[PDB]
Symmetry: C6
């Protein structure tokens, strides 16, 4: 029920999965608890609407169930353009994609931990080699440059309430016409922030559903 080999989907999942494995330390009496930051893919307005819905105190079980919601990260595509350096598709087209990575947090410390886990890997760019194999052929080698373009710090108060920092990223990637899922599912690998060759998980696995 979705175009699996979509190039946009692959870039969405790649970006999401780079930021999928981020935890914050939270000290308890019995001991330190490390919690994973759940990440979604959605238009920002959408996400924020639904976030205002979850954070709403309707009953007594909600009062507690409120601090499990934050911290979280929302991801979205916001712009793209041709990337000015016989047919077209591997050899493919140099495209350039703009992503907003929106971190939301109830505690400045939460934010500090998270961003400290992101920010140092972009100087200002972070390279990743991606391998996309078609059926059983030799995989393709796509050089992917991800550039940290800018950051944006903001709040939204009520008495605490909610800290929001947004990073903007430029992916220098590759576009080509759709290759039907029926012609075979694309196998994809990439190098993470430590040059560790992870293989790209299916979409359904990286993003929690806002729905």
């Amino acid at each position: 029920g979705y175009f699996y080999n979509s190039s946009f989907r692959r870039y969405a999942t790649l970006m999401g999965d780079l930021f999928s494995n981020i935890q914050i330390k939270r000290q308890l009496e019995s001991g330190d608890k490390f919690i994973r930051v759940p990440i979604t893919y959605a238009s920002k307005e959408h996400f924020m609407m639904k976030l205002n819905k979850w954070t709403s105190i309707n009953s007594q079980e909600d009062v507690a169930k409120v601090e499990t919601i934050l911290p979280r990260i929302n991801l979205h595509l916001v712009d793209f353009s041709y990337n000015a350096p016989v047919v077209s598709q591997y050899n493919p087209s140099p495209i350039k994609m703009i992503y907003e990575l929106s971190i939301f947090t109830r505690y400045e410390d939460d934010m500090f931990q998270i961003v400290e886990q992101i920010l140092p890997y972009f100087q200002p760019h972070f390279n990743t080699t991606m391998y996309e194999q078609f059926g059983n052929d030799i995989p393709f080698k796509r050089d992917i440059k991800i550039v940290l373009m800018s950051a944006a710090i903001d709040e939204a108060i009520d008495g605490r309430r909610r800290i929001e920092w947004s990073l903007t990223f430029e992916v220098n990637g590759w576009m080509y016409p759709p290759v039907d899922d029926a012609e075979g599912l694309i196998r994809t690998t990439y190098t993470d922030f430590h040059a560790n060759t992870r293989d790209l998980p299916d979409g359904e696995g990286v993003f929690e559903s806002v729905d």
Copy 2:
């Protein structure tokens, strides 16, 4: 009831027809269904008005027939200017025309499919050779450069509701004074995204009528 040989009409139809034959795959229980994206030519404000009129659930048969409406594409001319590099018409005038191609979709996946079918052919430009023959004379050969200028991503929510992406295109074309339909209808051919020589269909054939 229209000036058939209109230069503007030909550019509207040319653009519309390049993007006329775009389908999205939609996986069903019985098997995959492929649906064509219907295309219109209209002022954007107009299109959106009539679209809000259609999207309104008036009766029970409308509730279903709503997701037959989307996806669609609306096309319009939004600007033109002289294209700065004895009488006038073949030799004609280098003109430059600005088109807004507006894709509306209920599902991110629909969008991904469509745009993946448009975007790779503009690097940033796409050439097409056009042949316009007058009655039975030797056809004229007009070199047409179409350049992808920018993209713009947006929403418009209600609880799903509607994704809207707009591509802006610069057509580098040719203008000349009207040649009366009474002097004979122009025969028009062109090269598609695959250098395949289709001949330009009548207006009534490419655009579904917003009316």
Copy 3:
């Protein structure tokens, strides 16, 4: 009841008259009908007010009489400045005058026809030699460059309603102090869009009255 030899008047009429003789083809049951596009000289705000007064369906004999109103063209001066390349007047002062030519239309087709009759003659400029003779002396030869600067496309809806495209033109002309109508009326000729030497008609002849 007006300064006949007014320099501004002469430019208003020249511009008005270049665009005075434009017809659109309108296919009927009995056969093709050609209708002339009527031109007025007025502040834009004004013109649109009176146009909203005329187009308002107050009654039934109006219901029909509404589609005789459109299409039309309103012309106006909007800016002027010294034209940086013993006393003053022939030898006169190089002035530069800015005109807004506003085309209004109920049908996209009407617009296409009209503008296709304007646009090809400005690449980006259109020359005209003007001859202004004083009484019976040797006429003066003023070289007039008219440059197409920009175009602007708009609507204004109600259920159709009205298409509005405005061209902006830079006339590079000549200014001098007023020469009394009592010293004799100035004779003026010019070369039209086909270099055919028409002579400049009186104001009352070119523009229908907005009043």
Copy 4:
């Protein structure tokens, strides 16, 4: 009841007087009537307030007296700055003064007449030699350059009503500390638009009082 030798006052009057002597022809049956355009010096907002006060139909004795009010010209200073090319005053300081000259008119024809009498003398500048004599000493020779910087066209409707064109002028003049009226009144002459050496009239003669 005012500092007669005021430098600001002198420039205000020079400007007003260059534009003091302007008439429009107004054709009647009995014969042509020439009317002088009255000029005032006032903040623009002020002038317009009082002008809305005069033009209001309070009675029938007012109804006639309305078309004697327009046309008029309001003049005002709107900016000044040092003019970047032992003590201070002749030798004096190069200053630069900015004037808004505002023409108001009930008929486009009136405007054409007036502005046609102003505009050709500024190409883009108009020089005037000014002679300022102290008591009986040798007059000082101040070269004054007046530059037409821009023009601005506007209306203000009610059913006719009122045309407003504003010229902006850069006077390149001279400033020095105040020379008391008790030390003797300054004698001032200048060259008009025709190099005719008029001598600068007292303020009260050039400007009608808005008060």
Copy 5:
């Protein structure tokens, strides 16, 4: 009740005092009256509040008293920044300070007089040598350049009412850490608009109190 040796205070007082001694001539029947223009140091908003408070007619004794309030001058610091050309304080730090000098007046004539007394001494700059002596040591010589940056003309009406012209000045001065008033009071002299060496009056002497 204040840090007497404050560097900011010294610059505020220096500026205030250059403009402390400005009079306007006011011709009366009995004879000419010269009135000194009172100067305050305050935030512009503040000053205007209190000015509206003073100018308000609450009783009958106010009616007369009210027309003595204008003219006046309000002064304030509005910006400062480092002034780009072993420890720090004489040798001290080149700072640059921005002052708004705001002249308010009921009569154009009053304004003309005042400004004619300010404006000619800035071409565009006015130099002044300042001497700050510590206890009994050799005085320090600080070169102070004051530059006239821009001017701004405005009104505020009611039936007269009030003219407001503002000069903006860049003082190129010197900052250093605070030298306690207990370590001895700094003695300060400077050169006025005529290179005449006045010594800096205490704050309380230059500015009338807005409080």
Copy 6:
């Protein structure tokens, strides 16, 4: 209950502590009283809301306790970016951090005292060498350049009421991935405005709690 070795935290504390020790002189009859200006770390809006909560005169016990609140300083991070001049962390990444230092005060004199204690040490930059030791290893030497970028002056009145000046600072520092507190606590020293090597106090000591 916070990531002690957080880099953002260290820079917040470094900045806060350079400005931790600022006093103003306040003359009493019994003798001069020196009061330390308290510093907080908070988003500006937050600080201002809570400041409006403290400044509200609710009772008589409140009326006195009003002038103990001011003066104060609020500090916050507002922007950051890569600082464009085998793995990453000491060797670490050149980052650039933007801080808004907001000084609030009831008296101009208070402001003058404070800012005079800040401003002279930034010409436009101030260097500090920081030593960060991990457990017991050899310290790291991070060169920290703090640049004064701009200042901004404002009020907020009610009859006095409150002066607000804001300095903006560019810290040219260093980022690296989080080093767990469990791996040992970081020891930090730095050179203050006088090259005095103080050691960085814990967060809890520098900032008063806004909560």
